[PDB]
Scaffold this motif. Structure first.
Motif, PDB file in Angstrom:
ATOM      1  N   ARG A  96       5.531  -5.482   6.193  1.00  0.00           N
ATOM      2  CA  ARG A  96       4.987  -4.362   6.953  1.00  0.00           C
ATOM      3  C   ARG A  96       5.863  -3.148   6.682  1.00  0.00           C
ATOM      4  O   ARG A  96       7.062  -3.160   6.971  1.00  0.00           O
ATOM      5  N   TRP A 155     -10.856  -4.480   2.086  1.00  0.00           N
ATOM      6  CA  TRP A 155     -10.466  -3.204   2.678  1.00  0.00           C
ATOM      7  C   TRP A 155     -10.781  -1.984   1.815  1.00  0.00           C
ATOM      8  O   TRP A 155      -9.891  -1.275   1.330  1.00  0.00           O
ATOM      9  N   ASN A 159      -8.615   0.320  -0.793  1.00  0.00           N
ATOM     10  CA  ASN A 159      -8.217  -0.365  -2.019  1.00  0.00           C
ATOM     11  C   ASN A 159      -9.122  -0.052  -3.197  1.00  0.00           C
ATOM     12  O   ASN A 159      -8.649   0.141  -4.318  1.00  0.00           O
ATOM     13  N   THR A 199       1.352   3.686   5.362  1.00  0.00           N
ATOM     14  CA  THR A 199       1.666   2.321   5.737  1.00  0.00           C
ATOM     15  C   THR A 199       1.423   1.332   4.612  1.00  0.00           C
ATOM     16  O   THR A 199       0.770   1.635   3.607  1.00  0.00           O
ATOM     17  N   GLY A 200       1.934   0.126   4.804  1.00  0.00           N
ATOM     18  CA  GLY A 200       1.549  -1.006   3.991  1.00  0.00           C
ATOM     19  C   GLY A 200       1.624  -2.299   4.781  1.00  0.00           C
ATOM     20  O   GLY A 200       2.426  -2.425   5.710  1.00  0.00           O
ATOM     21  N   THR A 201       0.757  -3.241   4.427  1.00  0.00           N
ATOM     22  CA  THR A 201       0.800  -4.591   4.959  1.00  0.00           C
ATOM     23  C   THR A 201       0.694  -5.544   3.775  1.00  0.00           C
ATOM     24  O   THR A 201      -0.273  -5.481   3.016  1.00  0.00           O
ATOM     25  N   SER A 204      -0.165  -6.823  -3.729  1.00  0.00           N
ATOM     26  CA  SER A 204       0.409  -7.026  -2.400  1.00  0.00           C
ATOM     27  C   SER A 204       0.699  -8.499  -2.093  1.00  0.00           C
ATOM     28  O   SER A 204       0.972  -8.848  -0.939  1.00  0.00           O
ATOM     29  N   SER A 206      -6.028   3.842   3.388  1.00  0.00           N
ATOM     30  CA  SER A 206      -5.497   2.771   2.554  1.00  0.00           C
ATOM     31  C   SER A 206      -6.609   2.035   1.801  1.00  0.00           C
ATOM     32  O   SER A 206      -6.520   0.838   1.551  1.00  0.00           O
ATOM     33  N   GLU A 250      -4.850  -3.430  -6.787  1.00  0.00           N
ATOM     34  CA  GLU A 250      -5.064  -4.005  -5.462  1.00  0.00           C
ATOM     35  C   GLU A 250      -6.229  -4.995  -5.494  1.00  0.00           C
ATOM     36  O   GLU A 250      -7.184  -4.812  -6.253  1.00  0.00           O
ATOM     37  N   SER A 295       0.781  -1.239   0.000  1.00  0.00           N
ATOM     38  CA  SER A 295       0.000   0.000   0.000  1.00  0.00           C
ATOM     39  C   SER A 295       0.812   1.289   0.000  1.00  0.00           C
ATOM     40  O   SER A 295       0.246   2.369  -0.186  1.00  0.00           O
TER      41      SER A 295
HETATM   42  C1  IM2 Z   1      -1.780  -2.288   1.717  1.00  0.00           C
HETATM   43  O1  IM2 Z   1      -0.646  -2.639   2.007  1.00  0.00           O
HETATM   44  C2  IM2 Z   1      -2.967  -3.129   2.126  1.00  0.00           C
HETATM   45  C3  IM2 Z   1      -3.756  -3.485   0.890  1.00  0.00           C
HETATM   46  C4  IM2 Z   1      -2.797  -4.202  -0.024  1.00  0.00           C
HETATM   47  O2  IM2 Z   1      -4.841  -4.348   1.241  1.00  0.00           O
HETATM   48  C5  IM2 Z   1      -3.877  -2.292   2.980  1.00  0.00           C
HETATM   49  C6  IM2 Z   1      -4.457  -3.109   4.129  1.00  0.00           C
HETATM   50  C7  IM2 Z   1      -3.744  -2.493   5.300  1.00  0.00           C
HETATM   51  S1  IM2 Z   1      -4.012  -3.031   6.851  1.00  0.00           S
HETATM   52  C8  IM2 Z   1      -5.437  -4.063   6.716  1.00  0.00           C
HETATM   53  C9  IM2 Z   1      -6.520  -3.520   7.638  1.00  0.00           C
HETATM   54  N1  IM2 Z   1      -6.446  -2.081   7.443  1.00  0.00           N
HETATM   55  C10 IM2 Z   1      -6.845  -1.296   8.342  1.00  0.00           C
HETATM   56  N2  IM2 Z   1      -7.314  -1.746   9.421  1.00  0.00           N
HETATM   57  C11 IM2 Z   1      -2.938  -1.512   4.894  1.00  0.00           C
HETATM   58  C12 IM2 Z   1      -2.024  -0.693   5.663  1.00  0.00           C
HETATM   59  O3  IM2 Z   1      -1.907   0.490   5.285  1.00  0.00           O
HETATM   60  O4  IM2 Z   1      -1.398  -1.160   6.642  1.00  0.00           O
HETATM   61  N3  IM2 Z   1      -3.036  -1.308   3.599  1.00  0.00           N
END
Ligand code: IM2
Ligand code: NA
Length: 267
Positions: free
Chosen positions: A220, A81, A109, A212-214, A147, A107, A143, A46
């Motif tokens: 992370r 999301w 999608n 952020t990203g997950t 990811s 974030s 998305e 993300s």
């Molecule tokens: C981005 O890295 C992911 C996307 C690829 O699905 C989204 C999901 C999250 S965290 C999942 C739950 N989100 C909030 N409670 C993120 C993130 O920014 O950490 N991006």
């Protein structure tokens, strides 16, 4: 040596958490302050939504896009999301600016994909990276499949140094007008998803904004800027820690924030 302490502390985290930690910190001109695995490729996940918003603002600045243009959609655009997209679904649209703010701050999608549909897809995102001097970052997919973070896959990757330099270019290098630069900075500061990550490890008086990203397979990430008193920095942190729980990955990134802080304060 403060930089040796920085390296040693990151390597201790890596060893104890079975993790890889990529970090780059640069000054407003893109000059390296410090880093770790800084030219190793990591999945962007993300974090690319910040450069996507920069692309959108560039088009708004230029006049090739309008912030208030309504982007219509149906339930086909709801993917995992997509909180804001889901809320606006009955109304039938989100504006370019609403979608960009949801992408950056929640974030979202669906909102990200809505903008991707509009601006020319992953190829267009990649072209924007190249235009601002980033030859490394690449978006290949929308998305959430971008990811997937399959080990070894170079699709949808960046490096900490390439991304930190892209952040510096966008915020400090004149990529955007003063108005758009200020707006994107405020969006980053007001991000709703980063309370437990990088900014949790910074001093409470630093002005910090981040995205952020997950990813799957333990990714992370957190990228953005901080101002330590009067000094501005761009930073990119990418981590992979397959053996940690989600909470522990958050804590790992906050720990990286503390290691960065120790370096900045002691130098
Ligand atoms: C981005 O890295 C992911 C996307 C690829 O699905 C989204 C999901 C999250 S965290 C999942 C739950 N989100 C909030 N409670 C993120 C993130 O920014 O950490 N991006
Ligand atoms: Na539909």
């Amino acid at each position: 040596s403060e930089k040796l302490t920085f390296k040693t502390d990151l390597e201790k985290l890596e060893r104890e958490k079975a993790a890889q930690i990529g970090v780059a910190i640069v000054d407003p001109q893109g000059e390296i302050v410090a880093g770790h695995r800084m030219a190793q490729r990591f999945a962007m996940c993300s974090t690319f939504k910040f450069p996507l918003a920069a692309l959108v603002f560039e088009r708004i600045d230029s006049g090739t896009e309008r912030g208030d243009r309504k982007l219509s959609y149906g339930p086909d655009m709801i993917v995992e999301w997509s909180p804001a997209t889901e809320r606006f679904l009955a109304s039938g649209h989100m504006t370019v600016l609403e979608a960009a703010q949801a992408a950056v701050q929640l974030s979202d999608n669906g909102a990200t994909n809505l903008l991707l549909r509009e601006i020319g897809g992953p190829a267009a995102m990649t072209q924007y990276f190249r235009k601002i001097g980033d030859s490394v970052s690449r978006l290949d997919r929308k998305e959430p499949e971008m990811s997937d973070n399959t080990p070894g896959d170079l699709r949808d990757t960046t490096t900490p140094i390439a991304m930190a330099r892209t952040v510096a270019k966008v915020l400090y290098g004149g990529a955007l007008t003063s108005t758009s630069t200020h707006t994107i900075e405020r969006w980053l500061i007001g991000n709703q998803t980063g309370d437990a990550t990088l900014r949790a490890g910074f001093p409470k008086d630093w002005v910090v904004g981040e995205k952020t990203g997950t990813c799957a397979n333990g990714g992370r990430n957190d990228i953005g800027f901080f101002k330590a008193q009067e000094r501005d920095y761009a930073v990119a942190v990418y981590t992979t820690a397959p053996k940690l729980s989600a909470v522990e990955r958050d804590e790992l990134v906050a720990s990286v924030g503390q290691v960065i802080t120790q370096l900045i304060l002691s130098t």
